């Protein structure tokens, strides 16, 4: 089964990042990207989605995992980040709920029509 997200609004970049060895790599959005699109406070977001995972990660570590990916081979898709930075970034786990909140529709393609 294949899952497709459709939106008439450009999509936020999706980052594939391992936060725990036990979990392996997972998909995330940068929380600041989410908050900017909605013009929503961190506070209101966390209150409305108390069970969506948010984790903090070193920008340096973030940069290494993202640049490793062939899909981030364009300098423009990385220029907002600094490879040596010790700042922490917040990642929000990339769920259907978030996709929906941000205005998209999620469709499922099955073997038949």
């Amino acid at each position: 089964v294949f899952e497709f997200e459709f939106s008439e609004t450009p999509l936020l970049p999706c980052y594939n990042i391992q936060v725990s060895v036990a979990q392996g790599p997972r998909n995330w959005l940068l929380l600041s990207d989410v908050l900017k699109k909605l013009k929503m406070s961190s506070r209101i977001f966390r209150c409305n989605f108390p069970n969506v995972e948010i984790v903090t990660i070193a920008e340096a570590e973030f940069y290494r995992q993202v640049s490793a990916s062939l899909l981030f081979s364009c300098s423009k898709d990385l220029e907002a980040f600094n490879p040596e930075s010790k700042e922490l970034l917040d990642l929000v786990e990339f769920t259907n709920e978030i996709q929906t909140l941000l205005g998209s529709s999620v469709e499922w393609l099955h073997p038949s029509d």
Partner: protein, 83 residues
């Protein structure tokens, strides 16, 4: 999960609606063709997918198209469709 990638679809010479598409890197041209048919409410095989005005094979994955034609280009990958 597996890597996701971002597409933007464009009609070329009955229109879409939501032209930005996120899918799995393993999604294939044939799968996208059918999902598009569903959204446009068409029978099967009425949408072909193209890059730079050439038809993409049904078995090609979105990741291949990216690496072969979009490498080092800014996201999203631009594809076109005909009805």
């Amino acid at each position: 999960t597996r890597e996701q990638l971002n597409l933007c679809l464009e009609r070329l010479s009955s229109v879409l609606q939501n032209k930005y598409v996120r899918c799995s890197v393993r999604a294939e041209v044939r799968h996208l063709r059918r999902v598009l048919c569903h959204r446009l409410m068409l029978n099967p095989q009425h949408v072909q997918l193209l890059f730079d005005n050439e038809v993409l094979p049904d078995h090609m994955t979105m990741k291949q198209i990216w690496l072969s034609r979009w490498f080092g280009k800014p996201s999203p990958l631009l594809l076109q469709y005909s009805v």
